[PDB]
């Protein structure tokens, strides 16, 4: 209960049965998608840091799509997820990045590309951290499919 | 209403103090079997290339089915896959293309 952790998710429900990319800011709160915040707060999709320390930050971001051949389209897709942090400095700082390309075969009908990445970084008080993607319109936000988290690792 | 065995019924869901039943928002979340959930389960909205076959109520989740001409197999439940049109040579077709199966060609 006196613990520093957080795992916020894609709103939009659940399945069947100077900074590159664009920031994801449609993440939201209280255990229903099964999110939570705990000694951290939110600020337009940026987690804000109370306790200065080492934090294992992570996010998965799912890319789902179908595709066609068109008159003026190159089909190559660069799916990159960025995890930046805003510090006391004017311009954001990229912390981690993970990328993938789509298949090339003109025979592709669809694309399923989920991207997990994470790692510990030392953050200070009031450091703000956010996820950021390319091909945003391709990101599926079913709530298990894409999320964003961090914890303190004392 | 009030609890019944420490359970709230479908459509409803329990409170923090554990004492009262609260009711899932309509076409937003749900609960179908008797529960002790502090939160209603969120509603599905048909991913693309599907059809909504029934709306998400309060005691039933929305139902999605593959588009017409696409199927959904057990091990590929993530994209609806296009039904084949032809069979190969020396092979003859018995069993049309359904929402859950490809076409079925024999010899």
């Amino acid at each position, epitope marked *: 209960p006196q613990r520093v952790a957080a795992h916020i998710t894609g709103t939009r429900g659940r399945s069947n049965t100077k900074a590159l990319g664009r920031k994801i800011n449609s993440w939201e709160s209280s255990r229903s998608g099964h999110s939570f915040l705990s000694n951290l707060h939110l600020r337009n999709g940026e987690l804000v840091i109370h306790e200065k320390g080492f934090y294992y930050i992570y996010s998965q971001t799912y890319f789902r799509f179908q595709e066609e051949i068109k008159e003026n389209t190159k089909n190559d897709k660069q799916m990159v997820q960025y995890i930046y942090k805003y510090t006391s400095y004017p311009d954001p700082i990229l912390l981690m990045k993970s990328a993938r390309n789509s298949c090339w075969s003109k025979d592709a009908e669809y694309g399923l590309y989920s991207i997990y990445q994470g790692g510990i970084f030392e953050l200070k008080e009031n450091d703000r951290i956010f996820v950021s993607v390319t091909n945003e319109h391709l990101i599926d936000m079913d709530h298990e499919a894409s999320f964003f988290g961090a914890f303190l690792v004392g | 209403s009030s609890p019944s065995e420490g359970l709230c019924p479908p459509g409803h869901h329990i409170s923090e103090d554990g004492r009262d039943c609260i009711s899932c928002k309509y*076409g*937003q979340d749900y609960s179908t079997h008797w529960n002790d959930l502090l939160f209603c389960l969120r509603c599905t*909205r048909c991913d693309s290339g599907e059809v909504e076959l029934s709306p998400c109520t309060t005691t039933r989740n929305t139902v999605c089915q593959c588009e017409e001409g696409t199927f959904r197999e057990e091990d590929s439940p993530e994209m609806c896959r296009k039904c084949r049109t032809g069979c190969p040579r020396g092979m003859v077709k018995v069993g049309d293309c359904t929402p859950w199966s490809d076409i079925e060609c024999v010899h």
Partner: antibody
Amino acid sequence: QVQLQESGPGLVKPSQTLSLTCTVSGGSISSGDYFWSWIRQLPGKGLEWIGHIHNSGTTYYNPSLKSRVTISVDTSKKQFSLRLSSVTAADTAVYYCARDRGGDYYYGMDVWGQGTTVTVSS
Amino acid sequence: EIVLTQSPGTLSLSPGERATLSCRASQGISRSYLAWYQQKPGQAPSLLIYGASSRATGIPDRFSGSGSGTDFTLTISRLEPEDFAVYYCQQFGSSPWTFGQGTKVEIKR
């Protein structure tokens, strides 16, 4: 058959709260079906979906309208009401109320009111 | 937000000639979640096509809907002079429910 009446002030004052109400004739809101809904249309261009409400009193709003918006029902009173907040120039527009068949099999608005044109000034 | 993009802005066509209206969504969306509206000057809109390709009650067969994924098409076959309003698509895909800028069919006399 089923008809809708845009009742409500055609004027509201800069950063005061706009309000309107919709009336229902022939058949009643109650009936666990449709979503009673507010659409505005912004000086001769795009329609904007504001938010809708169900007969169980549960709402749905357009995020970007960073809750200024509230909307409600009274089946005993046969009307649903919208209220913006804090309004300005960018809130001046015709405001339709309408009945969307949530999935009671369509998805889409089969019934509209004629919609009142609201102007925000003092 | 999912963005619909109606092409083109306007169309001029004499009666009898054939009208193809495009509506293309920034992300692919069901199909159950695409509907078409017609809005005659000084009227509230009214529902033409629902479910990408279903005629609302009362709508003349002259009107048709097609498409899926991101590309959706509304087709008016043999134009009457009435049919010269403005036409909107909207998507109940996800959410805000959104509308396209709209395509305006103008008569040719």
